[model samples]
Target chain A: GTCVAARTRPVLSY
Target chain B: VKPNYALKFTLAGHTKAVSSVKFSPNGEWLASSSADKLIKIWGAYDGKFEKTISGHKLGISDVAWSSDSNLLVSASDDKTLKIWDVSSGKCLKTLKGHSNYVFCCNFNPQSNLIVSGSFDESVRIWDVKTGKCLKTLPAHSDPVSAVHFNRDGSLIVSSSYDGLCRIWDTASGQCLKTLIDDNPPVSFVKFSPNGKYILAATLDNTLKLWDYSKGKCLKTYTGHKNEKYCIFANFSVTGGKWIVSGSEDNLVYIWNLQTKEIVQKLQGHTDVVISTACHPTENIIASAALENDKTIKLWKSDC
Candidate 1:
C-alpha cells in the first residue's frame, strides 16, 4: 500500500 | 473577517431548506436533500445541475448512496426510506418499518440489508431487494440521530440524543459496546476510516474521537459553534489523516486528526451548517446549511 511506503518517509509540513 | 478555508463553488435549487449533502462513492454525483421534500443530483467536479427526484411527504433527514453509487437510500420525516435508481431518477422501492420519523440510514456494502436509525427509538435492518424489514433493534430510549456500518459491514454504529454512542453486532443484534459522553445530546457518531477509532459530534460544542476497542476517548476537538442540532462531520478522503465538521455559526472546520486543532475553516453560509461530507478520495468537501442558507457549498483546498 502507498500508505505503508509513505509512512516510512517524511511528508507532513503542516 | 478574513477567511482561511478556500470556498470553491455553490449550488442552489431547493427553495425552502436543505439538510444533507453526500458525494457518491464513484465520485460522479453529489446528492443533496432538503426540507422541501426534494433530492437534487449535481455533477461533482464541475457543479453542473442534474435531475431532481421528489417524492418524500415531509423533510428528508439523511441520504446514502449504494456501494456501486448507482442507487440511493433516503430517510425522511415521513417515516420511510426510499431506494432511488440514480440513472433513471426512479423510486425503485420504499422500505417501511419505522413508527416515527427516520433520521439516518446507511447501506451495508457486504449485504442486501439497509440499516436505519429513527426517532421511534429503534434501529432497523431492511432487505434492499424485497423491501422487507429484517430486524428491528430497540436501540435507544430517545431519537436515534445517526447510523453507519463499518467498512466491512460487521458492526453498526449509532448515536442517540439519549447520550450514548452504541455499537451493535450487525448479525446478532447484540450491543457490544456503549460509549457515553453524559455531557449533552450526542448528535452523530462515526468510526474512523481504519475502524480503530470513532468520532462523535456532540451538542456540547465538542467533537470527541474515541478508541472503540478500549472505550477510551483519544481526543476531543473544540472550537466550532454547535448548540442545538445533530450536526455532522467526516474524515478526509484518506484514512485518519484529517477531520471535518459543520458548525452552527456558519462554517466548516477542518482539523488535524492527531493534533486536535483546527487547521482550516471554510466560510460562506449564512446560517447553521448542519451536515458535512468529505469526498472518499479527493480534496473536495461539501456542506449543507440551515434553512436560512438554502444552499450547499462545495469547497476545495490545497491540502
Candidate 2:
C-alpha cells in the first residue's frame, strides 16, 4: 500500500 | 470556517522513538530526529526521503532548522549538539558545554545564535559560526526541558522540571521574568509569532499561554493526556490562530487559540504521540509517535 491517503471525511466537531 | 485536516502520508525509517519533527522555515524540507541517533531530511510536500545524517553517539532528543533551511541543529542524549549542512549531510560543528543530556535546541531568527536546555538545569547560548558557548545561565533548580528564541532574537524563554518558565534578555544574558503555576514540570515552550506571549506545555495535561511581560497566563487549554513524557506543543501558523499538541493518548489535538475549545482530534497512531510540528507556511502539520510506532505522519488541512 502506498503511504499517501486521500483527504479525510469532514467533521463538524470532535 | 474551521479547517479540516486528513492524513497525507506516513514516513518511517527510524529504529527507535521519533523524538522531534520540524519543518524548515522556507517550507521546503521536513527534518526528523530519532533515538536511533540519526536525523532524516525529507521533501516537505511529498514526504519523500531525501537524506540521512548521522553523528551523535546516543539518541537525539530534538532538532531545529535554520531560518534559510540550509543548516540544522540537533540536541542529543550524548550531552552535545551538532550543526549539520543539510545539502551535504555533513556535521559542520559539534557544540559541547552541557554537563548532562541536552534536551532541546532552537535557532535564533537570524540563524547566528542557538539556544539549548539540558538536564544539567541550565540554558546555554551558542555562537553558530564559531560553535562557542557564548553564555550559560543557571536557569532552574531541576532539569530544563525546553528553550526558544523570540522572533526578533532579543529574548529567550525556557521551561524546566522545577515548575518555572523564565524569560531572559539575549544580549545581557540576564533573567527578565519568571512565570509559574502550581508547579508541574513544563515539557515544552515557544514564543508566539507576535512575540507578545509564550506557549508552554506543562505535564499537568495543560498548555498555557502567558503574557510574559505581565507575568500572567492569559489562557489555559486542557483535554489531552500528558504526564510522563516531554510532549511538545506550539502555536499554529499564519496568524497563530490555533494551538497544536501531541498527547499521551496517541492522538494529535488542535485547539482554537481564542475560544480555548477543542477544535480537532487527529487519530492514527497506536503509540504515544510525542511531538507535533506545524508547517511554516502551508496548511500541514507533522506528528511523530514513540518507539512502538517510530513513524511521522503528515496531515494536510482543507480550509
Candidate 3:
C-alpha cells in the first residue's frame, strides 16, 4: 500500500 | 538469491550510527552497529568492547540506546528491528514488518518507544515494551535515510532519499512540516542538543542547519561528504559549540558551530566510516568503520 506512494528514484541515483 | 543491496552506498564515514542520537544520554555505554551484522557495546570509560548482541541474519545498520542505558534497539538489512536488554545481553523483542532493509532506529527519550526508518521507504513507530509496531507512516518517496525524535520527545524529523526531511508530531503522527532545500536528497537530519535547531547533511556535500520552529535555514556547515549512508552531523555535548561528522575520505570532521569552520579532522580508520557519535557527558567520540576495517575507534584529546 505505502509502496505505491514511495514510487520514485533512490537517493544515490543522482 | 544474490543480495539486492539497493541501499549499498559508496559515500560513507564513521559519524552516523543512524545519525543524531547514538548513545545513552547518561554516557555509560557507547554502542556500535556494523555492516559486519552485529552490535557491540563498549565501556565508554575503558574503551574496551564489552558485549555483543547478535541474531540478525544480514548486516546491522544502526542502533539507538535508551536514555536510562538499559535497552538498545537495532536496525538491520534482514528486514527486522530487535530491542535488546543491555544489562543481560538478551534480545527482548524482535519486531518484524518492513519489506526491505531497516536502516535506522531511535528510542524516544521519555518512554520505551522507538521510531525506525527503513529502505522499504517508510517509518514505523514501535513500542519496545509491547513488541508491537504502533504505526507505520508512509514517510518518503524514496528510502528513508534517518529519523530522530526531538530532545523533548514531542516531535520527529525524518530525512529521505526523496530529497526531503519532514517534521512529524510524535503524539498524533502527523506531518507537521517539510524541510527541503534546493539540493539533492537530505541524507542525514539531526536536532540540536536543546532541540532548537535541526542539522541536515545533504548530497551537495554540505550540512545545513535549520530553525524548526520558524522553518528557516539558520546556518550551513560545509566541506564534508554525505553522498552515501547516514553519514551524520551531530552537536558536541559541550554547549553544542562544535559539530562532529565523518567524511567520505575516511576522516572525522569537527566544525565549530558558531564560526562554522573546520576545527579538526581526526584520522584513524583505514576505510570509510559509517557512523559516529560523541560521548554524552565527556569530550570523547566513537566512530565505526565499514567493510574491511570493522573496528570501532574511540578518540579523546587532552586539553
User: Which has the greatest lDDT?
Assistant: 2
- Candidate 3, which CAPRI tier? incorrect
lDDT of 1 by residue, B60-145 (tens): 87889998998899888788899999899999999888998888888987548899998798999988999899889989998898
lDDT of 2 by residue, B103-202 (tens): 8899999999999998899999999999999999999998788899998999999998788999999999999999967587787888998899999988
Model 2 chain B: lowest-lDDT 10 consecutive positions: B232-241
- Say which candidate scores most in DockQ: 3
Residue B216 of model 1: what lDDT?
88
lDDT of each: 0.82, 0.87, 0.73
Q: Candidate 2: TM-score? A: 0.94
Instruction: DockQ for every model, please.
Output: 0.01, 0.02, 0.07
TM-score value, chain A, candidate 1 = 0.32
Q: What DockQ does predicted model 2 obtain?
A: 0.02
Which one wins on TM-score?
Answer: 2
Q: What total of clashing residue pairs does each candidate reach?
A: 0, 0, 10
Tell me the deviation in Å of residue B287 in model 2: 0.6
- CAPRI category for model 2: incorrect
- Misplaced by over 4 Å in model 3 are A1-14, B1-21
Off by over 4 Å in 2: A1-14
Residue-wise lDDT of candidate 3 within B1-303, one digit each (tens)?
111111111223322232222557787777776655556666776665577677767666678888888888888777888888888988999999999988878888885689999988899999878989888898998888888999888899998878888999888889999875654877788788788999988877888889977888888887876565567667885434688887778788888787888878877766566667877777767776555455566776431
Q: Is candidate 1 or candidate 2 better by DockQ?
A: 2
